[PDB]
Amino acid sequence: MGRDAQRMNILAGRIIAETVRSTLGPKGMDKMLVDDLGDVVVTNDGVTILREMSVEHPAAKMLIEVAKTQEKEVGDGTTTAVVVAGELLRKAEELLDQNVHPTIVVKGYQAAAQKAQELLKTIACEVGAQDKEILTKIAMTSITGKGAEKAKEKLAEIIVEAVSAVVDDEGKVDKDLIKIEKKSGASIDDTELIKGVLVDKERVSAQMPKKVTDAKIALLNCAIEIKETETDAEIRITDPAKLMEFIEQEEKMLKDMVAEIKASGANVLFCQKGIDDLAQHYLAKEGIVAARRVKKSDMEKLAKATGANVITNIKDLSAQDLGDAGLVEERKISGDSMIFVEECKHPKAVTMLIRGTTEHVIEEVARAVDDAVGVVGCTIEDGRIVSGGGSTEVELSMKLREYAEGISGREQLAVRAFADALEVIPRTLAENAGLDAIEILVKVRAAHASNGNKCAGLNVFTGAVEDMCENGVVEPLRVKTQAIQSAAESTEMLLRIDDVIAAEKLR
Amino acid sequence: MGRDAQRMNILAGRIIAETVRSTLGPKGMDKMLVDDLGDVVVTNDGVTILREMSVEHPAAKMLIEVAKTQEKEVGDGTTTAVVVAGELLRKAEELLDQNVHPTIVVKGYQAAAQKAQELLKTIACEVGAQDKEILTKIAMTSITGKGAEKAKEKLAEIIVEAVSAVVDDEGKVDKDLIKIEKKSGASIDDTELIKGVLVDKERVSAQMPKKVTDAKIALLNCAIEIKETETDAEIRITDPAKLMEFIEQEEKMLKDMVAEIKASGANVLFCQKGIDDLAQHYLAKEGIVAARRVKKSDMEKLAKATGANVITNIKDLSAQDLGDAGLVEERKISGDSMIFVEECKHPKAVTMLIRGTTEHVIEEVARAVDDAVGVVGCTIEDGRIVSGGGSTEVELSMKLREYAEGISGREQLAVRAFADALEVIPRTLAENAGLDAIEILVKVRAAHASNGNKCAGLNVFTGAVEDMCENGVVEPLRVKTQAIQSAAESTEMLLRIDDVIAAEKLR
Ligand SMILES: Nc1ncnc2c1ncn2[C@@H]1O[C@H](COP(=O)(O)OP(=O)(O)OP(=O)(O)O)[C@@H](O)[C@H]1O
Ligand SMILES: Nc1ncnc2c1ncn2[C@@H]1O[C@H](COP(=O)(O)OP(=O)(O)OP(=O)(O)O)[C@@H](O)[C@H]1O
């Protein structure tokens, strides 16, 4: 009973752990996912694989739940954490044949995790905020498995210039709002960096100007038209010449309503609903930008950038509830028509537009930008950049072997197993090639046996061995520490189960 | 085809390799062997196990043939060699999963064997011929799995005093003739060391003396009686009074024949055949020892000890074909009657008699004496006594790990595997106990990580760890080097087979 239900839980986890094994290197194979209706999709990363997966077995759920909590942190060390956890489980499964029972292995892993975390903090350097040439290599190496055939130089010079705006001034809080729009076009790969406001909404009546200098943005909500809500106090009619007079008065009231806004100092009208065609001419004889259908996601970016308040009615508008803009234009680019408002006041956030050919290419960039800025915000606030490319694990493996010699007991085999399991990263990064096999792992192991030589690792774009800091791979340390912590926490939630029962009571 | 016939040859060898695994330690279990007729025997060693074994499979024959050639050398490193070979095969079977094919492993083993042989010659000391207290510990530790409940002190003081006779004078050639007789008795365990000649033959006529001082041994073969062979030249008869006269003359000729031997200087008569009862009185009136039925194995020890020649006839005896003795006696000890001739001339060989209770105890000593002198003759001629008890393998394992770091390539995994396979001796010597398990191997591994500390090993008569040279375990180095050579030669005769065919032609 103790050994029957224990091996099944490990066998059920090793199947889902080795699924994202091939999707780890920069030049690895993709995954084809089909559905019952007939939706064939292609996924190259490992985050989407863990979501759309048959979680019918209880063992194939806790690991995914743990990985989802770690992916929402930095979003980079998700697949490697699952690979390390699977390697640890496979290494610990063989150690159960000596009849020692799972207990000392957990203590050994807990003792080795602290040593690894202490050693990782001593193999890094100090990166200040006055650098610039160092902050671009991390952005260049962040886009490898997504699509290096078009994103390797153009997408590495516009992210650093866009993020470095409020992070260098305040190195603590830099929570921005970055929105990526999924739209196609006709070009190969075009990247636009809008330094203003982007509105994704067209019109139907092209009878309004689209070039106003130093215009002012005025945010107006509802309660503007004649009928939009309801009225509890009902009215009555007496003479037929009174209703027509009231209608004419309510129609002419719009003239003075627009004149008041013009005299207050505003030339841009942003309404939540739609603007009637009869209210356009009144906005054309005065030079006021007419717009309609403003999404809340696009409207919330106007109060913190231009500087204006909202009006719940129509008679609550004065002079302090106005903003300031630069140039509002409506160009037809990439098929659809979008509104560009340039020169605001406080350039906090930024907008990035990607134009490709079909429809699956732009989406491929949608999962690449969010994973490219996340490695930047954790760089200025920290600065403990280590040597990426599978060099930290090999360096820690040479130290754990000599550190485990100072202790005596059955806990040394656990530390040795944890140290040997760290060599799975170079084996997976070299399996995608053909001229690597196993000689690369032997050559990179005896190279770090001297005094120095630490930045050397492995690159799949050459074949030989060289330094990683001189090429352009500078993976941070947080993405490794969080991955190691997740792997050490997930490997203990399965060995401490042993038996499994069932019940008919909810919760 | 290449991987189908290869795994079967290893699986057929691993079954016969792990059979003598339990029969290695001093306090291990025995083996019960049955036959078709119904012969149930008990064997504690591993040499007899390899002989009486079903060799119906071709893989289970070459290893036995190789072990038989090594057992005839010193007769001590036979079971351990098979254990090391099986461990090497089991370790190399797992390495074939990476698809490297057997080739570099053989080169790695050949490179590691030379390094091990060079390191073994540097961890020994110098033992001269003037020692005495050191030469008894090797004889005491040679009898452990045979029967330490009666052989641990009495059998450790009579072997050194018997071997040290012609070895200290000539330290090169010491080929002697040691014969062990299998006879029972009534005592618990008695050991007699005869410093002369022992004859295992009784009589039927107890009418001859058995106490003659400074007697002389005269070796006489056949051609003594009246009729023993044949005659081609036939004779005839003429008068009846002639045949009786010839018979009387031939009968009286024996009187002068014995008188001539008495005048020549001889009192002991050793004949190959039997002596008639009528020829006894003629040997009683002169004081001559009468004996009959002398085996060739007991007769060949008279020409090199007493110093006498043989006579093919009867008239070829003069005075130079005589020997010299001391005291010839015929005592009835342990049931049977044996002849003891003490005080010879050149005490070259020696005779050892073991008296037990039943019939299987004495035989248990028969397989213990030959394995106790063989470790002595190789001690004076060599003198490279190392620390026994499973301490040389652990010492070489710590050196091979650091020696394999100086090379690069796929040959390092073979050296590492060969080094890790050497740790099977302490695991087998500690498996027979209960309070050992695996902690002993971990404790004896980190103890040799300092500068000195080399004589420490493992003893099954205490439980803790201490030095082996101070207890009484001094296993020589030749029994280890020959075992390592046999294990390295036997592991290459199976991996170089791959495919196997058949034919109908003899040879
Ligand atoms: N040129 C390179 N040389 C060495 N290693 C590289 C190189 N490019 C990328 N890598 C490695 O690839 C890894 C990233 O792989 P990829 O972006 O394909 O998926 P991932 O981001 O690991 O997926 P997840 O975020 O789900 O873990 C990094 O950890 C990095 O070490
Ligand atoms: N007190 C002891 N402490 C440690 N090791 C011991 C002790 N006594 C014996 N041994 C080990 O036991 C081994 C001998 O075992 P045993 O005599 O039972 O069979 P064997 O002679 O090895 O059989 P074979 O001659 O077929 O190999 C020696 O190699 C020695 O190292």
Side-chain angles (χ1 to χ4, degrees):
Chain A
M1 181 60 180
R3 299 300 180 270
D4 190 10
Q6 183 179 182
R7 301 298 299 271
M8 190 274 300
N9 183 271
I10 304 180
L11 264 59
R14 288 179 59 181
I15 298 300
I16 51 96
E18 299 180 0
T19 304
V20 295
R21 178 180 298 269
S22 60
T23 59
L24 181 60
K27 300 181 300 180
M29 299 62 62
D30 300 1
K31 298 299 181 181
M32 179 179 60
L33 289 78
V34 300
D35 299 330
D36 49 352
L37 274 67
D39 300 70
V40 180
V41 298
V42 179
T43 299
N44 183 268
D45 302 330
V47 181
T48 312
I49 305 299
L50 299 180
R51 299 184 299 181
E52 285 73 16
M53 181 180 296
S54 300
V55 289
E56 51 84 21
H57 198 274
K61 180 182 300 300
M62 301 182 61
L63 287 77
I64 304 180
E65 181 68 22
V66 171
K68 288 182 178 180
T69 58
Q70 190 271 349
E71 189 271 347
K72 299 180 300 180
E73 300 292 337
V74 294
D76 180 70
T78 301
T79 303
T80 171
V82 181
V83 172
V84 171
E87 182 68 22
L88 288 175
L89 292 179
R90 186 181 64 91
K91 185 62 62 180
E93 181 183 1
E94 188 271 347
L95 300 180
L96 299 179
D97 300 330
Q98 288 74 11
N99 299 330
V100 296
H101 99 283
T103 294
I104 313 179
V105 186
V106 181
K107 181 180 60 180
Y109 287 165
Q110 289 295 91
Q114 301 292 339
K115 182 60 180 180
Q117 292 180 0
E118 292 292 338
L119 290 179
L120 285 178
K121 298 180 180 60
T122 60
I123 60 179
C125 60
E126 299 291 338
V127 180
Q130 293 78 7
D131 300 329
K132 184 61 180 61
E133 195 268 350
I134 310 297
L135 287 315
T136 180
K137 299 191 302 299
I138 176 61
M140 180 180 300
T141 191
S142 181
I143 307 180
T144 56
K146 307 299 181 300
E149 69 284 347
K150 60 180 60 179
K152 60 180 180 179
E153 183 70 22
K154 300 180 181 180
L155 280 307
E157 299 180 353
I158 43 89
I159 301 180
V160 184
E161 298 291 339
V163 175
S164 299
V166 299
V167 185
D168 53 354
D169 200 333
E170 300 292 338
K172 181 180 180 180
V173 180
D174 53 354
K175 180 60 180 180
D176 300 331
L177 300 180
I178 301 300
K179 180 180 180 180
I180 300 300
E181 187 68 23
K182 300 179 60 180
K183 289 298 180 299
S184 300
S187 61
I188 300 299
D189 180 70
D190 181 67
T191 299
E192 298 180 0
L193 192 61
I194 300 300
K195 295 297 183 60
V197 183
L198 174 58
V199 180
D200 303 330
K201 181 57 183 180
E202 302 180 1
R203 57 174 57 181
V204 69
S205 300
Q207 300 180 0
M208 301 301 301
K210 54 180 180 300
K211 183 180 180 60
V212 181
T213 311
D214 54 79
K216 281 76 61 180
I217 298 180
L219 284 75
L220 288 315
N221 299 90
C222 300
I224 301 180
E225 291 77 11
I226 171 181
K227 180 180 180 180
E228 69 284 347
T229 57
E230 60 180 0
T231 302
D232 300 330
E234 60 180 0
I235 60 180
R236 60 180 61 90
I237 48 95
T238 58
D239 300 331
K242 185 180 60 180
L243 191 146
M244 300 300 180
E245 181 180 0
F246 285 166
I247 291 300
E248 182 180 0
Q249 180 180 0
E250 294 180 359
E251 188 272 345
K252 295 181 301 180
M253 189 66 60
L254 183 60
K255 300 180 180 60
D256 58 74
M257 205 284 300
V258 177
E260 180 68 22
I261 302 182
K262 178 184 180 300
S264 300
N267 299 89
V268 181
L269 179 60
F270 284 158
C271 180
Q272 181 180 0
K273 299 300 179 299
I275 301 300
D276 191 69
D277 56 76
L278 298 180
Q280 301 179 2
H281 188 197
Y282 296 154
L283 300 179
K285 300 297 298 180
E286 300 179 359
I288 300 180
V289 181
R292 62 182 62 89
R293 301 300 180 180
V294 178
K295 190 179 299 180
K296 182 180 180 300
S297 180
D298 300 70
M299 186 180 180
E300 62 180 0
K301 299 297 298 300
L302 301 179
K304 60 180 60 180
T306 60
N309 300 330
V310 299
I311 290 87
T312 60
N313 300 330
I314 181 180
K315 300 298 298 300
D316 300 330
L317 179 59
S318 60
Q320 59 180 0
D321 299 72
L322 301 179
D324 189 8
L327 179 60
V328 180
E329 197 176 0
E330 299 182 2
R331 300 183 300 268
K332 182 181 180 300
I333 177 63
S334 69
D336 53 353
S337 300
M338 297 177 298
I339 302 179
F340 300 87
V341 180
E342 301 292 338
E343 186 179 359
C344 298
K345 182 180 300 180
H346 299 277
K348 180 179 180 180
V350 78
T351 305
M352 180 181 300
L353 179 61
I354 301 299
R355 179 181 60 178
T357 60
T358 59
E359 68 283 349
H360 61 266
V361 180
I362 296 93
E363 186 271 346
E364 185 68 22
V365 192
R367 60 180 65 259
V369 181
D370 53 354
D371 298 332
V373 60
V375 300
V376 181
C378 300
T379 302
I380 304 300
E381 299 180 0
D382 299 331
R384 303 299 298 180
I385 299 181
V386 299
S387 180
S391 60
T392 60
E393 292 78 10
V394 186
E395 182 69 22
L396 267 60
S397 182
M398 300 300 300
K399 300 180 180 180
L400 290 180
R401 291 184 177 91
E402 63 180 0
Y403 179 79
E405 299 179 1
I407 59 180
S408 300
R410 299 181 179 180
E411 59 180 0
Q412 184 179 0
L413 300 180
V415 182
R416 179 178 298 183
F418 180 82
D420 297 0
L422 295 180
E423 300 180 0
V424 70
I425 301 300
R427 296 193 299 266
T428 52
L429 293 180
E431 188 69 21
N432 301 330
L435 300 181
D436 296 2
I438 205 180
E439 184 67 23
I440 298 296
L441 180 60
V442 185
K443 289 184 299 181
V444 303
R445 179 176 58 184
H448 299 269
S450 300
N451 300 90
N453 187 23
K454 184 180 300 180
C455 301
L458 175 57
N459 183 23
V460 300
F461 296 154
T462 301
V465 289
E466 70 283 338
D467 300 0
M468 301 300 300
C469 299
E470 300 180 0
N471 300 19
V473 180
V474 277
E475 185 177 4
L477 186 60
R478 181 180 180 180
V479 298
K480 291 297 183 60
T481 58
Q482 295 292 339
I484 292 180
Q485 181 180 0
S486 180
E489 190 271 346
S490 180
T491 185
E492 299 180 355
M493 300 295 101
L494 301 181
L495 300 180
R496 299 178 64 259
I497 301 300
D498 186 66
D499 297 330
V500 47
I501 60 179
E504 300 292 338
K505 182 180 180 300
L506 180 60
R507 301 181 296 101
Chain B
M1 181 60 180
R3 299 300 180 270
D4 190 10
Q6 183 179 182
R7 301 298 299 270
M8 191 274 300
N9 183 271
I10 304 180
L11 264 59
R14 288 179 59 181
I15 298 300
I16 51 96
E18 299 180 0
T19 304
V20 295
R21 178 180 298 269
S22 60
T23 59
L24 181 60
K27 300 181 300 180
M29 299 62 62
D30 300 1
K31 298 299 181 181
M32 179 179 60
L33 289 78
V34 300
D35 299 330
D36 49 352
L37 274 67
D39 300 70
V40 180
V41 298
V42 179
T43 299
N44 183 268
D45 302 330
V47 181
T48 312
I49 305 299
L50 299 180
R51 299 184 299 180
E52 285 73 16
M53 182 180 296
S54 300
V55 289
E56 51 84 21
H57 198 274
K61 180 182 300 300
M62 301 182 61
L63 287 77
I64 304 180
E65 181 68 22
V66 171
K68 287 182 178 180
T69 58
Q70 190 271 349
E71 189 271 347
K72 299 180 300 180
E73 300 292 337
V74 294
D76 180 70
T78 301
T79 303
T80 171
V82 181
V83 172
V84 171
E87 182 68 22
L88 288 175
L89 292 179
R90 186 180 64 91
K91 185 62 62 180
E93 181 183 1
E94 188 271 347
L95 300 180
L96 299 179
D97 300 330
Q98 288 74 11
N99 299 330
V100 296
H101 100 283
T103 294
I104 313 179
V105 186
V106 181
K107 181 180 60 180
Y109 287 165
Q110 289 295 91
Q114 301 292 339
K115 182 60 180 180
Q117 292 180 0
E118 292 292 338
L119 290 179
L120 285 178
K121 298 180 180 60
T122 60
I123 60 179
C125 60
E126 299 291 338
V127 180
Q130 293 78 7
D131 300 329
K132 184 61 180 61
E133 195 268 350
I134 310 297
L135 287 314
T136 180
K137 299 191 302 299
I138 176 61
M140 180 180 300
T141 191
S142 181
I143 307 180
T144 56
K146 307 299 181 300
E149 69 284 348
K150 60 179 60 179
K152 60 180 180 179
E153 183 70 22
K154 300 180 181 180
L155 280 308
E157 299 180 353
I158 43 89
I159 301 180
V160 184
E161 298 291 339
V163 175
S164 299
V166 299
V167 185
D168 53 354
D169 200 333
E170 300 292 338
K172 181 179 180 180
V173 180
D174 53 354
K175 180 60 180 180
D176 300 331
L177 300 180
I178 301 300
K179 180 180 180 180
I180 300 300
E181 187 68 23
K182 300 179 60 180
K183 289 298 180 299
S184 300
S187 61
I188 300 299
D189 180 70
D190 181 67
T191 299
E192 298 180 0
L193 192 61
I194 300 300
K195 295 297 183 60
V197 183
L198 174 58
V199 180
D200 303 330
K201 181 57 183 180
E202 302 180 1
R203 57 174 57 181
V204 69
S205 300
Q207 300 180 0
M208 301 301 301
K210 54 180 180 300
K211 183 180 180 60
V212 181
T213 311
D214 54 79
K216 281 76 61 180
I217 298 180
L219 285 75
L220 288 315
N221 298 90
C222 300
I224 301 180
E225 291 77 11
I226 171 181
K227 180 180 180 180
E228 69 284 347
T229 57
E230 60 179 0
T231 302
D232 300 330
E234 60 180 0
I235 60 180
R236 60 180 61 90
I237 48 95
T238 58
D239 300 331
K242 185 180 60 180
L243 191 146
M244 300 300 180
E245 181 180 0
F246 285 166
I247 291 300
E248 182 180 0
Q249 180 180 0
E250 294 180 0
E251 188 272 345
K252 295 181 301 180
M253 189 66 60
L254 183 60
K255 300 180 180 60
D256 58 74
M257 205 284 300
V258 176
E260 180 68 22
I261 302 182
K262 178 184 180 300
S264 300
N267 299 89
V268 181
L269 179 60
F270 284 158
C271 180
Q272 181 180 0
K273 299 300 179 299
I275 301 300
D276 191 69
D277 56 76
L278 298 180
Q280 301 179 2
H281 188 197
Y282 296 154
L283 300 179
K285 300 297 298 180
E286 300 179 359
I288 300 180
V289 181
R292 62 182 62 89
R293 301 300 180 180
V294 177
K295 190 179 299 180
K296 182 180 180 300
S297 180
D298 300 70
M299 186 180 180
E300 62 180 0
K301 299 297 298 300
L302 301 179
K304 60 180 60 180
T306 60
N309 300 330
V310 299
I311 290 87
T312 60
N313 300 330
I314 181 180
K315 300 298 298 300
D316 300 330
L317 179 59
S318 60
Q320 59 180 0
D321 299 72
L322 301 179
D324 189 8
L327 179 60
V328 180
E329 197 176 0
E330 299 182 2
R331 300 183 300 268
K332 182 181 180 300
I333 177 63
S334 69
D336 53 353
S337 300
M338 297 177 298
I339 302 179
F340 299 87
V341 180
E342 301 292 338
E343 186 179 359
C344 298
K345 182 180 300 180
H346 299 277
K348 180 179 180 180
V350 78
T351 305
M352 180 181 300
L353 179 61
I354 302 299
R355 179 181 60 178
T357 60
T358 59
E359 68 283 349
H360 61 266
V361 180
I362 296 93
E363 186 271 346
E364 185 68 22
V365 192
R367 60 180 65 259
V369 181
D370 53 354
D371 298 332
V373 60
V375 300
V376 181
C378 300
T379 302
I380 304 300
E381 300 180 0
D382 299 331
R384 303 299 298 180
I385 299 181
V386 299
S387 180
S391 60
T392 60
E393 292 78 10
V394 186
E395 182 68 22
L396 267 60
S397 182
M398 300 300 300
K399 300 180 180 180
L400 290 180
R401 291 184 177 91
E402 63 180 0
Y403 179 79
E405 300 179 1
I407 59 180
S408 300
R410 299 181 179 180
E411 59 180 0
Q412 184 179 0
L413 300 180
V415 182
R416 179 178 298 183
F418 180 82
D420 297 0
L422 295 180
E423 300 180 0
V424 70
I425 301 300
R427 296 193 300 266
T428 52
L429 293 180
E431 186 69 21
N432 300 330
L435 299 180
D436 296 2
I438 205 180
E439 184 67 23
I440 298 296
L441 180 60
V442 185
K443 289 183 299 181
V444 303
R445 179 177 58 184
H448 299 269
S450 300
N451 300 90
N453 187 22
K454 184 180 300 180
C455 301
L458 175 57
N459 183 23
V460 300
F461 296 154
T462 301
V465 289
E466 70 283 338
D467 300 0
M468 301 300 300
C469 299
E470 300 180 0
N471 300 19
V473 180
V474 277
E475 185 177 4
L477 186 60
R478 181 180 180 180
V479 298
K480 291 297 183 60
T481 58
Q482 295 292 339
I484 292 179
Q485 181 180 0
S486 180
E489 190 271 346
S490 180
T491 185
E492 299 180 355
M493 300 295 101
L494 301 181
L495 300 180
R496 299 178 64 259
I497 301 300
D498 186 66
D499 297 330
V500 47
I501 60 179
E504 300 292 338
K505 182 180 180 300
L506 180 60
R507 301 181 296 101

